[PDB]
Amino acid sequence: GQGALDRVALGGLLNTLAARVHCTCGKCLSVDDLLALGRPEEPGHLARLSAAAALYLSDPEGTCEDIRAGRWASRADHLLALLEGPKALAPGLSRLLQRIQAQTTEACVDPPQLLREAGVAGAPGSPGPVLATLLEHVGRGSCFHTLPTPQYFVDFVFQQSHGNTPNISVAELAALMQRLGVGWDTVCLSARDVMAVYGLSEQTGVTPEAWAQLSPALLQQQLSGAC
Amino acid sequence: DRVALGGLLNTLAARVHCTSGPCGKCLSVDDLLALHLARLSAAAALYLSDPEGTCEDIRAGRWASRADHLLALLEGPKALAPGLSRLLQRIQAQTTGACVDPPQLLREAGSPGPVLATLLEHVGRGSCFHTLPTPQYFVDFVFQQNTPNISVAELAALMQRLGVGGVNSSSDTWDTVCLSARDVMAVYGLSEQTGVTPEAWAQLSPALLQQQLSGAC
């Protein structure tokens, strides 16, 4: 009866997953794995399944290893958690789709659209239904496009600039200002001056939050032409 | 004592380099008498701020008024520190052009009256001043250099001026994306109908920098 439909339905879901990843790593994935995740009646079973699938798309090799270890359900509940967090969902989804793009291989589907399409009356969807909505799109063979996330732009400067400190050194800050052609209207600020404006201790250096804070001044300094 | 006022006059005149000039001659002890500590310190700060302009005001008998005004502009809630900065900028312009900043003056002083008096002391020692803008100033500036907000089009002109907006072995595949103005807005969930508000400009600033440092355009 249902055992059998579930097996054809879930079986087909597994087959599209395997295909989109080009694992048609595919052997490890079986209907019984998907069955193992939960009893359909349990509230948050669609979520757990949608997340488990998203994980598979996100990391096939890694998700087989987890499946073998019998921790697929746990790792799926973990992802729902990461995304259930305060302001976590939108950027978490972006990162998740970037990975799914990586492993997946004209207009395409983006996270804002997925957030719209799940959830109600202009509000963003919550993780389970959002991920389901993602799955349903994978099933329709939609392509995905993602823009980067706000944190990505600050993170990027900390990864790119070569420094032993966890924060940006006044020296580091000054090298960057140089690369940008920098370091009332017409004053030209030093790196130190920049720090002084935002009440930043040179011993403490520039943290990511701080980089974000002093960003407008770096722009102004460039547009100003003062330097 | 008009002996004291006399010396005050002489430093004021000197630090502005009006000693053997007409702008120094307009300043008379009786002017200073006509003008209490606060009013005097402010009147003097004004003179240092704008000698030519302050003679015209003095000769019109409105020096006291203009001085009470400056005390007002500085009496306010979070007015004093930045007001003092702007004032010192002007005074550095007219006199000269290891330094003293407004936090130091506030500490050494002890509101506006005694602070101005301490500024004046420093002018007397010949100290140099170092003054900074406020964080708000940097956002507020871009908006001048006319919808109320910045248009997507405006945003795009700015990105062009910065060499971005599109007008090898990447650690992240986003490292290669070159964002449109519209994309920039999309990242931060900003409506194109509303435009870029100052708070929004602040928010999207890091991406403009990244886009340049990235070399993706």
Author numbering:
A (entry chain A): 37 to 60, 64 to 144, 151 to 228, 262 to 305
B (entry chain B): 42 to 76, 84 to 145, 152 to 164, 171 to 205, 209 to 230, 256 to 305
Which of the paper's sentences describe this entry?
ZIP4 is the exclusive zinc transporter specifically expressed on the apical surface of intestinal epithelium and responsible for dietary zinc absorption. ZIP4 knockout in mouse is embryonic lethal, and loss-of-function mutations of ZIP4 lead to a lethal genetic disorder, Acrodermatitis Enteropathica (AE). Structurally, the LIV-1proteins share a similar topology: a transmembrane domain (TMD) with predicted eight transmembrane helices and a large and variable N-terminal extracellular domain (ECD). In this work, we present the first crystal structure of a mammalian ZIP4-ECD at a resolution of 2.8 Å, which reveals an unprecedented dimer centred at the signature PAL motif.
A ZIP4-ECD from Pteropus Alecto (black fruit bat, pZIP4-ECD) was found to have ideal behaviour in solution. pZIP4-ECD shares 68% identical residues with human ZIP4-ECD, and cell-based zinc uptake assay confirmed that the full-length pZIP4 is a functional zinc transporter. In one asymmetric unit, two pZIP4-ECD molecules form a homodimer. The structure of pZIP4-ECD shows that each protomer has two structurally independent subdomains. The structure of pZIP4-ECD is stabilized by four disulfide bonds (C59–C64, C67–C103, C153–C188 and C266–C305). Two pZIP4-ECD molecules form an elongated and wing-shaped dimer: the two PCDs pack together and form a central dimeric module, which is flanked by two HRDs forming the ends of the wing. Structure superimposition of the PCDs reveals that the HRD of molecule B (HRDB) rotates, from the position of the HRDA, ∼20° relative to the PCD dimer, suggestive of structural flexibility of the bridging region. Most interestingly, the absolutely conserved proline residue (P294) in the PAL motif, together with a highly conserved serine residue (S293), are located at the cross of the two α14s which are at the centre of the PCD dimer.
